[PDB]
């Protein structure tokens, strides 16, 4: 229970690397040291490497030198997937293709200064003379958040009795603002059996009188989930980005509360 990452799509003959600190609770003290809006940075880059005679270790090294190692978990929240396909039948098993999927946010004014300088030097960097490292500004994010409430009889397994499902939708300027407002509130109030914490959390995020509807449902339930789907809105009309890098909040009331229910 808590923040669970969704399984990686694991292709046939492909090295896959996942780097994230999105699992770490938002640090409101740190984030208060950012005094301006800055867009979430997006990387959705891919390239054919057939014929360049690169190994997967060469591809991973170049991406680490120009991207991964420049984005520190002390200055940024990031979620990054790096993949490198190789030719199983080639006597050298040379890399045939690669991709970088990332979103990341500077957490402070000093991180924003460091970022502006990283972008000036590295935005547009020639990767393997095949494609460029394009770091894009998301215009904003729409969170389409699902709530599940129900009764699970075995906490080690996936199946449960679903009692109620709700969706609500919010626009934020960045993933930074998602973490500062919604994610911090999940940690503070969604994981509470104090009715004056969780019922008002529901009034704010689910629907304005969800607190009244859910009192009886929470008393009958032992298991909640929140799935905040992050839909990044890009600058061009009709361009959305959703990272394969997904997380959800599981709340095992059965184990957290003395009475083994959500209320």
Residue numbers in the entry: 7 to 269
From the paper:
Previous proteomic analysis of culture supernatants from wild-type L. pneumophila 130b strain (a clinical isolate) and a T2SS (lspF) mutant identified NttE, a 288-amino acid protein encoded by the lpw02811 ORF (lpg0189 in strain Philadelphia-1; lpp0250 in strain Paris; lpl0249 in strain Lens), as a secreted substrate of the L. pneumophila T2SS. Crystals of NttE were obtained at pH 6.5 and the structure was determined using selenium single-wavelength anomalous dispersion (Se-SAD) phasing with electron density maps refined to 2.2 Å. The final model contains two molecules in the asymmetric unit and all residues could be built except for the N-terminal His6 tags and the NttE residues Asn1 to Ala6. Each NttE protomer is formed of two domains, with the N-terminal domain (residues T20 to N143) composed of 7 α-helices and 3 β-strands, and the C-terminal domain (residues D7 to F11 and G146 to L269) formed from 5 α-helices and 4 β-strands. Two disulfide bonds are present in each chain of NttE, one in the N-terminal domain between Cys62 and Cys90, and another in the C-terminal domain between Cys259 and Cys268. The NttE dimer is mainly stabilized through β-sheet interactions provided by the C-terminal domain and the presence of this dimer in the asymmetric unit strongly indicates that NttE is a dimer in solution. The NttE α1 helix mediates hydrophobic interactions with the α4 helix in the C-terminal domain, and it appears that small changes in this interface results in large changes in the orientation of the N-terminal region. However, analysis of all known sequences of NttE homologs from Legionella species and A. siphonis revealed a conservation hotspot at the interface of the N- and C-terminal domains, positioned on the “top” face of the NttE dimer. Comparison of the two models with lowest χ2 values with the crystal structure of NttE-130b highlighted significant variability in the positioning of the N-terminal domains, although in all models the β1 strand remained tethered to the C-terminal domain. Together these data indicate that the N-terminal domains of NttE are mobile and this may be important for its function in modifying the bacterial cell surface and/or during intracellular infection.
L. pneumophila also expresses a type II secretion system (T2SS). The Legionella T2SS exports at least 25 proteins. In summary, using a combined cellular, structural, biophysical and biochemical approach we have provided a characterization of three novel type II secreted substrates, NttA, NttC and NttE, that are required for infection of several species of amoeba. We also report the X-ray crystal structures of NttE and NttC, the solution nuclear magnetic resonance (NMR) structure of NttA and dynamic analyses for each substrate using complementary biophysical techniques.
